[PDB]
Amino acid sequence: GSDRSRFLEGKRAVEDKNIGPLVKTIMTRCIQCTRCIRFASEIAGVDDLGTTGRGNDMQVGTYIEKMFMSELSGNVIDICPVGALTSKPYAFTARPWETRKTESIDVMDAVGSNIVVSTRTGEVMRILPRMHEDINEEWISDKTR
Amino acid sequence: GLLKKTTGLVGLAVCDTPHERLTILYTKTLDILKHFPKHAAYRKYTEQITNEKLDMVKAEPDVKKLEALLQGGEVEEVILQAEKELSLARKMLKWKPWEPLVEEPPANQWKWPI
Amino acid sequence: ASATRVIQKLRNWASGQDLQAKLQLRYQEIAKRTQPPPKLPVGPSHKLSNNYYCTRDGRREVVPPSIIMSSQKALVSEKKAVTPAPPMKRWELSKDQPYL
Amino acid sequence: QLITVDEKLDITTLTGVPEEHIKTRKVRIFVPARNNMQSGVNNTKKWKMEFDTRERWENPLMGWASTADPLSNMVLTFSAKEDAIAFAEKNGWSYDVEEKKVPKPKSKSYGANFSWNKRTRVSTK
Amino acid sequence: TSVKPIFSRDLNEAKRRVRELYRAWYREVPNTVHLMQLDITVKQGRDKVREMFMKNAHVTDPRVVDLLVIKGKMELQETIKVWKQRTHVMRFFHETETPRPKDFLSKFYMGHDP
Amino acid sequence: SKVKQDMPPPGGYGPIDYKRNLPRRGLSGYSMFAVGIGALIFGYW
Amino acid sequence: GVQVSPSGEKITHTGQVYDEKDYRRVRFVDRQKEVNENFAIDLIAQQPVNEVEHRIIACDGGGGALGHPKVYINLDKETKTGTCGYCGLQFKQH
Amino acid sequence: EMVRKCDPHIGLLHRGTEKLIEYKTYLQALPYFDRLDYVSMMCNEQAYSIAVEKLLNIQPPPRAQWIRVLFGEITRILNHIMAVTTHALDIGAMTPFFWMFEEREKMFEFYERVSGARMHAAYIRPGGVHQDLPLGLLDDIYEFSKNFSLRIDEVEEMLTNNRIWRNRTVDIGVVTAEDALNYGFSGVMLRGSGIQWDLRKTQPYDVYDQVEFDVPIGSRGDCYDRYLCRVEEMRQSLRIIEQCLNKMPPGEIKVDDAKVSPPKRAEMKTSMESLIHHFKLYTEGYQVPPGATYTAIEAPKGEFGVYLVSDGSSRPYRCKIKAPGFAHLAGLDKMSKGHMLADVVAIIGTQDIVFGEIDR
Amino acid sequence: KRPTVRPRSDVTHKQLSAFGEYVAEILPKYVQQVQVSCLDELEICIHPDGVIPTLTFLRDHTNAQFKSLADLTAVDVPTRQNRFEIVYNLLSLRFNSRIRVKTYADELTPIDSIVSVHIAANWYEREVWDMFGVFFFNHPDLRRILTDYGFEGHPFRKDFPLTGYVELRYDDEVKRVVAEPVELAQEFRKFDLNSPWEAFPAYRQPP
Amino acid sequence: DMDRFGVVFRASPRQADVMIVAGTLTNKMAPALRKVYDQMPEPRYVVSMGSCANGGGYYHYSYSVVRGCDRIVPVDIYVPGCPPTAEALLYGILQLQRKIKREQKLKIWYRR
Amino acid sequence: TYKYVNKKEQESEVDMKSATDNAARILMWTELIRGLGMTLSYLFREPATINYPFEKGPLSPRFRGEHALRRYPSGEERCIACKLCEAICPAQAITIEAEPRADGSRRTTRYDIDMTKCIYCGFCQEACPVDAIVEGPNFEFSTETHEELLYNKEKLLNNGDKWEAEIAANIQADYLYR
Ligand SMILES: CCCCCCCCCCCCCCCCCC(=O)OC[C@H](COP(=O)(O)OCCN)OC(=O)CCCCCCCCCCCCCCCCC
Ligand code: SF4
C-alpha cells in the first residue's frame, strides 16, 4: 500500500452494537468483508448476522438487539482481521509484541484442541487457537478462551 | 633532472639511481615467472604488467614524467611494489595457487538470508 | 565590553592583536531566545497525483547480489589485466596556503 | 592430514556454561504456529529452538517480573530441522521435536454458493 | 570421523600436554598464594586444580582437549602474571554460593526446578 | 502562509577568517643585545 | 477519591492499597506514598455534554496537532451519548 | 624509566553494545553510536545512518546532508579541542583546556538547541534528520566561527613555537608509512607520516564533493606534525562551516517515504495511513532488506567503520564497529621504543584515544 | 532521477565484476562464489586454507595493493555446520577501492593467522577468539582482550544469553567482588516484532 | 567552575575526600573501583553519576556490566542523566555539601 | 587538495642578522614571553563563570530532562496505554499494565520508568500519539537513594501537574518542527 492519504473529506461513524459479554463491537472500523456472517452461518449454524442497507451506510450486524451467544463465538475475534470486534476480557490489557507464546493444549473437553497460551511478565493474558486439521480446525470453544 | 631531496613519505629513502633498480626487479620477475607453468594466470598477467612498466622505464628517463606515466606515486613506492611483487612471485611458486579447487564447501554455507 | 580602555590596551598588546571585536563572550549579537513561529516546508511525494509508492520505492529495487564463479553451479571463473578501478589520481597542492 | 573421531560431537567443555543449564534443561524444536489474528504465514517457515520456562516472581518493590535463569529470552532460528538437532546434540541439550504442521489443501468454489441441490447454497452474499 | 587435528595426532599425545599443564599449575600455586596474599593453603589450591581438571575428564575428542589445554595455558599466563587479582582466583572456590542441593526433596521444599 | 526554515540571509554571510595569524613582532636582537651589554657595562662601572 | 483505608493509607485511582498484614508498609515509615489527589475519573465527570446539530462530528483535544488523532463519533442513539476514546468528552444532537 | 614492552589490557568499557544491537531495532540501536565515541557523537550516528541508508537504497535530501556535514565538522572541532587540550594537560600545559572548553560549551548549546541534548543527540537518523533546526541558529554558528580563529591562534601562539612543546613532541611517535598501513592506522596517523588519504576527498558521502577544503599532511611522523594537522583540520572545518552556512537549501529534512522515516506530527493526526506508519515505525521498525555493507567515514580520529549484516527483519543480525584507536593502541608498543614514561604518555595523547569505541 | 531512492551507476559494478573474474581465475585453488551486490561492494569467498595466500596476494600484487586491514569480523550462524563466517574488509589506497574476503570455520576447525601479512590482525584475531571461540594458529599472544580475566564463555555467539551466567557484587564476609549467579529484578522483555508478510519478493525462499 | 566552591581534583585516592563514578562500571573494572574506594581515607563519600552507574543504564542487560555501583561502593548521592548536565552534577555536589552539613556526629557521641 | 604543515620550502640562507635574531630568540626566551603575555591578557578578561544557583545556563524548549505524564485541559488523563513508548524505549525502562477504568476507557494501572535505565533520548515523547509523556526541563532532581529514581504513575503525574506551566510553553514553542 501507499504511505499517504489524498483524502480530504469527513469520515463516517457507525453505531455500535452490544452483542454480549465477550465480543466487543466497535463498528466504526469494520471493512465490510463478511468473513463473520459466513462463519456464523456455515460453522456455528446461527444465521443471526448480516448486512443492513447499502453504500457506505451498510452496517454489519443484526438489525436488532440480539446476544450472539454461541459455543463458537469467540472465533470471530480471530476471524475479523480488523479490530472491529475484539474480546472484552483481553480488553486493553496487553499488546502482541509484549507477549510470549507457549504451545499447549486444552483440558476442558476431551477433544485435545491445540492452543497457544499468551503470557506477559509471568501472567496469562489470553488464549488462542493453534492450527491442527485433525482437531481444532483453527477453531476453539468459548470456554477454553 | 634533480634528486628530490624529500620524498614526502616517512621511512622511504630516495634511490638516487632509478631506471636501473626497476630494470633489475622487473627482469627478475620476468625470469622467475618462467618457472611457473603456462596455463597459470598469474604468470600471464604479471608478465603483461612488468613488460608494460619495463617499456615505460626504457622510454622515459625523466623521473617526473616516469612517475606520471607509471601511476604508482613516487618512484620509490614503485620500487617497493616491485620488490614486493617479486617476493609474492616466489611465495606463489611455493603455494601452487593454480591447482583446482580443494574441498568445495557444504551447500548452505554462503546462502544468505537463511 | 567593560575594560576601561587601558586594560583593553594592555590585553591587546600582551596578546598581540585586537580582541575587543572578537570576544569570548556574548552580549547582544546572538539570536534571541523567543522567536516567531515557522512554517516548515513539505517535500516531494506530496504531489497529490501521479505519485504511487511502487514508482518511488527504493527498498524494493534491490536484488540479491550477482554471482561469479560459484562452485555450486558450472560457471567459468589475450585477456588483458585488470584493476579494481583506475588509479587514484594524485592530489594537487593547494593554492590559498600550500606551505603553512 | 585427518583424524577418525567416532564419538558424538560435544562442546559443553568449551561453551562456558554450568552443568545446571546443560543437564537439567529441556529444549523444544519447532516451527511456531501462525497467529490466528493475522492471516500471514511468514513468521512460520523457520525452525526455532526454545528452552523450558522457569520461575518468574513478583519483585517486592514495584511488582516487576524477575528471573533466575538467563536462557529465558532465548530463541534461535534454523533453516531446517537436522541443523537444530545437530546444534542441540552438540551443545548437550535434551530436545523434543514437534513435526511440521502444514494446512491441508482444499477445493474452493465460488459456484458452490449458488447450487440447485447442495447445502452449500448460502443464504447471504 | 574424517576430521582435521589441532596439535594432537591422538588422545595420548594430548594427555601429554595435559600433564605438562597440570605440572605448570602445581609448580605455580605456591607462588600465587605468596605474591598476591591469598588466605588459603597450598594443599587446597592444588586440590582445586585437580578438581577443575577432573571437571572435564569425560572428554575423548582430542580437539576439545587441545582447546582446553590452550585455555588452561591462558589462565596460567594470567595467574603467573598478576593480570588477575585475588578476586578472580578466589572466584574458583565459590566462597559465597551456598551448595546447590543434589537431592530431590530439598529441591521440592524450595523451588519448582528439577 | 508561506514557508520559513532558518535559511541564511540574502547576501550570504560575512567572510569567516580561518588562516593562521600570529603577528611577527618584537625588536631586532641587535637592539636587545645592545641593551643588555649596555646595562652590564653601566653596572660594572 | 482519596478515601483512606482503615490502615490509614491513601488509596489511589488504581485502587491499590496494601493490606494490614502486608509487610510492604514499612517503606512508608518516616515517609509517605506519592498519590495524586486529582483523579481524572471525577474530573472528566465534572464536564458537561457539548450539544451539537449533526449525527456525525469529530474530536481532537482542542489544540489540533497538540491533542489527539481526529476521530468521528456517531450520535444516532438517544438513550446514551457519544464518547471519545482518547479524551472522555460527550456529545449529543438536538 | 624507559619502556621495554607495552601490553594494553583494555576491556574496562566493554559492555556488549554489538549484542544489544543485535537484540534491538535499527532506530533503537542509534544512541549506541552516540555513546561509542563520546566526543564525536554526530559522526558515529552519521556513519550508522549512511550504512542503513545504503541497505535501504534510500538517500536523504540536500538540506539534511548539508546540516549533517556541518555538524560533522562541528564534531571535528569538538574532538580536536579535546585531543589537543588533553594532550597538553598530559604534557603539563593546562590553560588551553579551560580556554577551549568554553567554546565547547557554546557548541553544546548548538546541540541542545537543535536536539535537546548537549552531547548524545540522536539527531542524525537513517532517513535524513529528526528535527529541523530552529530560527536564529545559523547566525549564532556564524558569530562563533568568526572568532574561533582567534581562539585557535591563541593556543597556537602558546604551544607551537614553544621549546618545551617542541622538545616534548618532536621525534616522538615516529611512524613509517609502510608501518602505518600494515598496523592499520587511519586518518591523522597516516597523514602525519605523509600518506595523502582522506575519505572526505576520495569517498565523499554526503555533500563533501560540493564543498572545498584542503587536507593537512605532515612530512615527519612525530607528534608535532600530527598536532599541527589537527589544528589545521580545525581551521579547515571552520572554512567548511562558512560554506555550509552560505548554502543551506530549503526543503524536507527527512526522506519523504513514511515506510522508513516517520511522518509529521500533524499528518499522523488527520491521516490514517501515516498513523499506521507511525505505529509500525515506532513499535516494530522498517524491515531493511537482506544484504550487508561496510561503510566508513572520516571520524575526527580516523576511519570509523560499520559492517552491518541484515535480513528481512526489523533488527540487525550483526553490527561490528571499526574503532580508530584499536589499531592505534595496537601500534602503541611499536611507537614507544627507546622512549620514556612521559613520552609514552604523550604518545597515548597523540592517538586521539577514547575507549568507548575500542572496548565498546 | 527519483529523489527518495539512491542514485545508481554501472561502471563500478563492471569494474568489480572484472576484478572478481581476475581473482577467480588467478587463484582457483581456494576461491568460491565471487559476488557483487546492488551496492557495489565486491565480496570474494575463500576456503580457510587459502587465507594467507589470498591476503598476501591482495596486499602485494600490483593491480591489487590491498595493504590496509579495516576490519576483521566474525558472524555466528548456528544453522550451518561451519558456524562462524569470518570477514576481511580491505582497501587499496592506489585504486580507491575496497574488497571483502570471506572464509568459514567451526568450534574445532581453526584458521591460520595473518600477522605475517597484516599486523593489524593481532588484536582482531584476539577479539574473535574471545567473542566467538575461533582459535588462530601461529599467533604471538592470542589471549583475551575484552572479557574479564576470569571469564568462561564466548559472548557474541548466538547461543549465549545477553545477560550472562554470572553477576558481580561486593561482599563484606570476604571483602572481595565475588561472582554470584545471575538473578535479575526485571527479566529482559523479548518482543516478537517480525511481521507475517513477505516484504521483499526478490529474496523469497522457495520450498 | 568547581574550584569556585573549593572542589579541586587530586589524582591519588588518598589525597581525596570523594569519588565520582562518571561512567559505566564493568565486571573487569569493579575490583579496581573497590580498591580505590578502600584506599580512600575516611571520611569519604561517593557520587554515582549517570544512568550507567546509578543503575546499569543503557547496558543494564549486558553480560559485562554491574547493574549499579550500589553493589560495589556505598553511594551517598545519585545524579541522573545520560549524560547528566554539568549543571546537574553541580547541583548534586551542592546537595552532597548539604548532606555533610547535617552529619551530627559529635552530638551523638556526647549522647552515647 | 593538500598542503604541508611542517615542510620547509628550502634552507641555506643565513647572515649575521638572522643569526643574531635566532641567538636572541635563544638566550632571551622571546617566544616564551609571548606565552606569558597571552596568559597575562587572559588575566584581564571577564571570566566566563556564573553564580550557578542564582544565575544559570541557557537552555532551549527542546531540552529533554525529567519526565512527566500530562493531562488534557479538562484534567482527563492523557495516556491511553497504547504501549509503544516501551516498544521503542531502547533501554527497556518503561513498563505499562493497563485495564478498563470502570468508566469504559483505555487507561493505565501502571506507568513505571526506571530513570536509572533511561537514556533521555526523547523517543517516547516523539512516539506518543497524544503528547502524554514528555521529557521536561528539570535537571535538578538528584537523590540520595536509588529507590527514589524508580518512578511510577503517581510521581509522573505529580511532575506533570507541577511542570505543566513550562511544558505547555515548550511544546507550543517547538511544535511546527516535530
Ligand atoms: C661585556 C661582554 C661580556 C658580557 C657577557 C654576557 C653576554 C650575554 C649573556 C646572555 C646570556 C643570557 C642567559 C641565557 C641562558 C639560557 C641559555 C639558552 O640557550 O636557553 C636555554 C634553554 C634552551 O632553549 P633551546 O631552544 O632548546 O636552545 C638550546 C639549543 N642547544 O632555554 C630555556 O632555558 C627555556 C626553559 C626554561 C623556561 C622557564 C620559564 C622562563 C620564564 C621566563 C621568566 C623570566 C623572568 C626572569 C626574571 C629574573 C629576575 C631575577
Ligand atoms: S469480519 Fe470484521 S471486518 Fe469483516 S465484516 Fe465482520 S465485523 Fe466487518
Ligand code: SF4
Ligand atoms: S490497528 Fe488495524 S483495525 Fe485497529 S484501528 Fe488500526 S488499522 Fe484499524
Ligand code: SF4
Ligand atoms: S553519558 Fe550515558 S552512556 Fe555515557 S556513561 Fe553517562 S549514562 Fe552511560
Ligand code: SF4
Ligand atoms: S505512547 Fe503515550 S499514550 Fe501510549 S502508552 Fe506511552 S504514554 Fe501512554
Ligand code: SF4
Ligand atoms: S527518553 Fe528514551 S530511554 Fe528515556 S524513557 Fe523515553 S524512550 Fe526510554
Ligand SMILES: [Zn+2]
Ligand atoms: Zn477526543
